[PDB]
Design a protein around this ligand. Structure first.
Ligand SMILES: Cc1cc2nc3c(=O)[nH]c(=O)nc-3n(C[C@H](O)[C@H](O)[C@H](O)COP(=O)(O)OP(=O)(O)OC[C@H]3O[C@@H](n4cnc5c(N)ncnc54)[C@H](O)[C@@H]3O)c2cc1C
Ligand SMILES: COc1ccc(S(=O)(=O)Nc2nc(-c3cccc([N+](=O)[O-])c3)cs2)cc1OC
Length: 374
């Protein structure tokens, strides 16, 4: 007597949506074309989960959520590093490992009635007034579902299938921005004032704001920090023609990382950093009329890294949707319709504060404390 749902994509948002719909009693099947990540056979290593992200997770799986979330490191504020290495504490997010979080969600799903189908690529959907026929490559295969949830990322195959059934406003924009993953190792000895082998304070998000480029650092449980450099494709491509050019760039702009980061390794991470396509995506509506499908996460609204908070937004997507389904007593057609109306309102504002955040933190940086004169 239960309805079936296909959830396309077992990233962070797909796993959470599957937990939520299995909890609510739907017959959930969760698809991904990738292999089970938990086998020996990630856009970042540790990520920040916000209070709102945590609450979404809590609303959906209260039991698991504390087990899922207790290696996470609470951040009390941001620490701003200037060109002279001065650090300013600005008191207020929690640091958590991406792979660990994704795997824990998969583990919780295994305790559920959810069917996990890895190595299944959605290629086509036939939409009807009854069940939706999902075509997979696994070897073509079809399966029928009462409805479909697209959690399949910025390039959503689901979204493209939906566009055939509904008139969807849609935009994609490839941003100039690139990011490079850097690493700050644990210290040799335990540091009492920090509560671990941390080179710098682990209870702050560290930010080295510069003019249209930036370094950040976020603590990992083992004392290390996940660090990320952000800059334009042109700036980075201009730098990495020369190892010496990269090295001197880092020393000049981030002098207080020289002692805590392997600069020779950092240079190599710059030079050999892989091809990236950061794309921003928006669309309207998020649903196929009659409750037949809905888009959550990056599939609905891929946004700019750091200035936007995509995982947190996607987690909030799921919480909002479940509350609407409950408000409508399981009427998916009316719930999905209200979801697209109210979420789009939210997301224009979210995109609004993201750009404003870009403006104050990275565009408007000309002070002598933050911009070098040479
Ligand atoms: C460097 C970086 C750091 C970030 N850090 C943070 C952070 O700290 N906090 C935060 O809030 N956000 C962060 N974000 C954003 C966050 O990573 C994303 O918003 C989020 O992971 C998107 O989750 P998702 O499940 O919607 O999509 P995805 O992670 O893209 O997963 C989609 C899944 O669908 C699968 N799939 C795709 N197509 C198909 C198909 N046709 N058939 C079957 N399966 C398919 C894919 O294999 C994939 O597993 C970061 C982004 C970047 C670039
Ligand atoms: C470890 O690397 C990452 C860590 C965290 C995140 S995040 O998704 O959680 N983004 C976040 N931005 C802020 C933030 C701080 C101050 C000013 C502003 N502002 O936009 O004005 C935003 C805190 S957390 C992303 C990362 O890589 C992209």
């Amino acid at each position: 007597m239960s309805e079936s749902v296909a959830i396309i994509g077992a990233g962070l948002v797909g796993c959470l949506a599957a937990l939520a719909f299995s909890k609510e009693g739907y017959n959930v099947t969760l698809y991904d074309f990738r292999q089970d990540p938990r086998l020996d056979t990630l856009k970042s290593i540790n990520l920040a989960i916000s209070a709102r992200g945590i609450d979404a997770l809590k609303s959906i799986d209260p039991d698991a959520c504390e087990h899922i979330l207790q290696d996470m490191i609470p951040m009390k504020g941001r620490m701003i590093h200037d060109l002279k290495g001065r650090q300013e504490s600005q008191l207020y997010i929690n640091s958590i490992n991406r792979s660990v979080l994704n795997n824990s969600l998969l583990d919780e799903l295994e305790k559920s009635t959810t069917e996990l189908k890895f190595g299944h690529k959605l290629v086509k959907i036939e939409w009807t007034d009854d069940k939706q026929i999902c075509h997979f490559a696994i070897t073509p295969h079809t399966e029928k579902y009462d409805f479909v949830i697209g959690c399949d990322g910025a390039y959503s195959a689901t979204r493209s299938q939906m566009q055939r059934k509904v008139e969807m406003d849609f935009s994609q924009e490839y941003m100039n921005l690139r990011y490079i993953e850097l690493y700050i190792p644990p210290t040799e000895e335990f540091k009492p004032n920090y509560g671990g082998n941390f080179a710098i304070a682990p209870d702050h998000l560290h930010i080295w704001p510069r003019h249209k480029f930036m370094l950040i650092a976020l603590a990992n449980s083992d004392g290390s920090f996940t660090s990320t450099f952000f800059g334009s494709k042109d700036q980075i491509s201009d730098l990495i023609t020369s190892k010496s050019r990269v090295r001197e760039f880092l020393i000049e702009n981030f002098p207080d990382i020289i002692n805590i980061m392997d600069l020779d390794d950092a240079v190599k991470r710059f030079i050999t950093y892989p091809k990236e396509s950061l794309v921003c995506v928006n669309c309207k509506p998020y649903d196929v009329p009659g409750g037949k499908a809905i888009l959550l996460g990056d599939a609905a609204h891929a946004m700019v890294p750091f200035y936007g908070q995509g995982m947190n937004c996607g987690f909030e997507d799921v919480r909002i949707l479940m509350a609407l389904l409950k408000k409508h007593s399981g009427d998916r057609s009316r719930a999905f319709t209200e979801y697209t109306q109210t979420r789009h309102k939210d997301l224009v504002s979210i995109t609004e504060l993201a750009k404003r955040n870009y403006k104050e933190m990275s565009h408007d940086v000309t002070s002598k404390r933050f911009l070098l004169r040479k």
